[PDB]
Amino acid sequence: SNQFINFHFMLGGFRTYVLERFFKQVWYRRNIRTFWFPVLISYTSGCITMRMYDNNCYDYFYFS
Amino acid sequence: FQDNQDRSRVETNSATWAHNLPKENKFNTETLEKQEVESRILK
Amino acid sequence: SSGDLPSATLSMIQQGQDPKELVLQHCKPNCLHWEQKLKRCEAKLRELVNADPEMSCMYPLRDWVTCVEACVQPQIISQLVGAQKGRIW
Amino acid sequence: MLTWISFWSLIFWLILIILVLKPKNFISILFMSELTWLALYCLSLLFGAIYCDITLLSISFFILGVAGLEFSFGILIAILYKNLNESLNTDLNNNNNNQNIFDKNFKTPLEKINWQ
Amino acid sequence: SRVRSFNDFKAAKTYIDTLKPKLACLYFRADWNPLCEQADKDFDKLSDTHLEYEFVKIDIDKAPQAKGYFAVRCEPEFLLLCLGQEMTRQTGQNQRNLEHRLFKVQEYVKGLNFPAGMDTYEEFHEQYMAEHTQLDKEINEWAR
Amino acid sequence: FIYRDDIGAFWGIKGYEELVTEVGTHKGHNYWPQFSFLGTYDSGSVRRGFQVFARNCGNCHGMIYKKYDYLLDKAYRQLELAQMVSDFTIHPAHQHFKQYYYQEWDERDRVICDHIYPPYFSQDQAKNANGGVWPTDFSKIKLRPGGINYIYNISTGYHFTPPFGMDVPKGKYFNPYFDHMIIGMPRQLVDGLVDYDDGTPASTPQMAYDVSNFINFMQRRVGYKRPDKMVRYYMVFTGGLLILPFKYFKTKAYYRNLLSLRWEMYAVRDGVYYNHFKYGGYNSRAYQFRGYFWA
Amino acid sequence: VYGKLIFNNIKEYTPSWIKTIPYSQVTKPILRKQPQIVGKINADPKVKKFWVFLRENVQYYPFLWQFFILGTSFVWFHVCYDPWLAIYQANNAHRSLETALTKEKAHKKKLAEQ
Amino acid sequence: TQKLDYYAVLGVDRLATAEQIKDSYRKLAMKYHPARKFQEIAEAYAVLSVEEQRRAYDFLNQPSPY
Amino acid sequence: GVLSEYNQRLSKKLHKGHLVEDKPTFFVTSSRPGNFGDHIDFKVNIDNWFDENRVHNEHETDIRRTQIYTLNAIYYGGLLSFAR
Amino acid sequence: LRALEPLLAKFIYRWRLDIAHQRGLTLEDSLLFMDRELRRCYFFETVARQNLHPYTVLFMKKRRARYYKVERGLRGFYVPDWVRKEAEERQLSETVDNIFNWENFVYRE
Ligand code: HEC
Ligand SMILES: [Zn+2]
Known part of the structure; x- marks a missing residue:
């Protein structure tokens, strides 16, 4: 009852606080560094395999 | 909204390469301190 | 004042007629690629004296029909009674 | 290692970029403008040879003439800089603080501001 | 701290x-x-x-x-450095001015931003020698 | 994670390569008022659709799971619906569950609380009357490719010839929207077949649109209840969005306020040993660790 | 990070080689009243009067506070309910059974007097 | 409370000696000793009396002329 | 106004977005027991939120308590509307 | 392994070192006593209570707390330079001494 109701909420403004702190320091630094590489590899490989399987299906269905 | 208390513009920029600590304004009318003059006179 | 005035044009939907044949024969140029592919498939299947029953011109025709009705169906519905949009959205 | 056409187009535009880049000294800008005219001279000759066109060689010598007249004007304008109280470095002709210059410092011609 | x-x-x-x-x-x-x-x-x-x-x-x-090494001219001298770079310098004896300089330098540095990997400590002369090879070296190569 | 579009399997769902499926929804956009944003059913459209169903479609098909009084308050009034339903007759043999309630032993006029039964007594009778095929029940016809668009497309789409290699036997017709493109339904909707009560011109697309609207209206989870539920979804979304700031205040601001502590550590050298640290400690799982772990 | 391992032969809670901070380097407390951080609305004496009244007459009676919470829930429901229903009903005015019946009656009159 | 200017309260300029501050406080204390204004005077003199406290107060202000 | 509050909060000096102390800081409780010696040379606090997180409303605290009750009541009212 | 040395140096040693320095810690706090040992490990607690002085685990916990008090309140926290410098003052040789001595003591006793 002797403190801020919302302390430190938007110090530095939208740009500094939200962009820098939230995105770069939390989201990127704590999540994307860890999984961007394996997730990218898995997504690309899955897309390639699905495309090959669909091409085999297309060859099965269409003879011309 | 126009704030008349803010009188800064591109004309008043006072960033110099030599001074690592930027000066208060762009008027180079800073005088020496009393102790510096006395010490140099003693020298 | 509009609504209390006579209508200048009477479409054939408003005459209780089906324009679907005209719309089909007008949406065909939009899907010439699929139509040509279906013709080529039919020509290829005709030449083979013996063919697997799994082989048919059914799928090229399915694609061509899909394209033609993609062109055709919405514009016929858009003129019907009860297909008007809402007052705001 | 680069084709001459692309090389010379890029050279002309890079010369213009470097002319803009360098500090605004009138003599330096004059020299770079002469270099720009010479690059145009070379490009015109190259295309004249490629396309078997005789008008571009004319462009070469007309560039020579235009550049000569422009250089004469530039020499006279610099000597005019002498007589007026102006510096050949234009960045020293204003009080706008510039971080690119180590020693830019101007103050009012007063010995002191306050008397009492 | 402690002297x-x-x-x-x-x-x-x-x-x-x-x-x-x-x-x-x-x-x-x-x-x-x-x-x-x-x-x-x-x-x-x-x-x-x-x-x-x-x-x-x-x-x-x-x-x-x-x-x-420190370009000291008139003792006593108080040289205030940030990351080895000369923030400011005071000549003479006055405690109030020294404290004011310390406070000003502290607040300005606390209001500063440094890109990662470019906030390392450097030696004093390193600033003078960097500009020496940029200005003094070429001048000496033309006059002498 | 990416699927082809030219193999006939929409979005990776396989099994429907033998018919046209995406016309209503994916390849082309058929407008239905009840499926738009803040849209609802058209009462006149549903009314005309029920008229079309009663005069033509109900002579072969049925909606066993549903009764006539679904149309109350949205398409018909009680009295007019009563006469219109009474235009048809029902039998005790029609009833799926003829308990002691249905004490009749002959034909009688239908009532609005009766299930919508076909004129046939049984599915086998329907098959026998319709040349071996059964007119499908419309109770759950929503689970067809493009649903309401499926009904509309089947009603229309009798304007093509089979390709080479496809043979259409007698009693069957070519329809690209039906499975295997061979259907046992002759073309039903002809121009001016049904005289509308409201005077709307009666064309084949109009009747197909109306009957599709009516059949979709009778459905569950997608008819006569969806629009109000979407409005409820919008209200609840607005409530959550407006309550987000107060949740942030309470939780995050309270935590940040509680974590604003001051800590001080001092040197204690008064000659007292830390016997409580050396000879202290409790563990609730000691009853598990004892006798087994670290002996 | 600080030093070698310490075993139980030291017998003192703070070892002699742990440095202490002299009192000259300790931050002294501030013993004056700082200006309040308040907004324009809450600095109004009328708003303070309202807060005092609300506290003393509703907050100090827990069941009255529960009635206050019920009122807040009522306001929440009506705020989230009324505008969506209003716009939804205004959007579909022309798609009504009353409009359909009006058209049917007009057509019936025309056909009768035809 | 609200933000307060101690030099304005004591009626002295920033570059004033300590004895000037003492004299100003005594002159203002003879008048309002027997509420809010006297409290402001007391707070200003308490802050400005100690050289360290006065220096710390002056450093944060960064005064403007006039 | 909200614009004014944003304007004052825009000028705060921070270290990579966090309001933390720029120097080591030590505090001593003058009324601490005599067996407690001096502050050990360990930086126990990086921040100063005990002093920075203040509104200085010690002359009116029940008002802030009532405001916190009101915010809690609004949150509970939304939850109770859904439960109803 | 000798051909793979630069990758291991970049993605194992330097990765953990950078994360620890950002948190204001060193490889001490991640390699001497494990996280699962400082909390809910009756064997480690018994050995520490029977042989160790309180300040070892206490100082490690104090560093963790001084970081996470700010981190929990406002996430994405980088310690200032005066904490990172104190962290960087400690080298890996003393950490190796501490780790080896602790492991040998635990085994032997
Ligand atoms: C009796 C001659 C019928 C009338 C009148 C209507 N339909 Fe019909 N329909 C009939 C049969 C015998 C069949 C089955 C064909 C087969 O080979 O299985 C059908 C089928 C349909 C379907 C297909 C449903 C499916 O299971 O995929 C639809 C959508 C359909 N009928 C609609 C329909 C409508 C809207 C009618 C009123 C205009 C209608 N039918 C009349 C027999 C008869
Ligand atoms: Zn055409």
């Missing part, structure tokens, strides 16, 4: 370069100036008061080379 006293220039320089302080205050003193007696007490008081700086005192008489 670190030095009489040898090499030892003091090695200590400062090993510490690599973010904010440092160097007090160069000599015995020719009678006012240096009060400057010692002022330096001690400000050192115990302030904890963000590292306070190093150098006796110029016992370490003359230090003077030449």
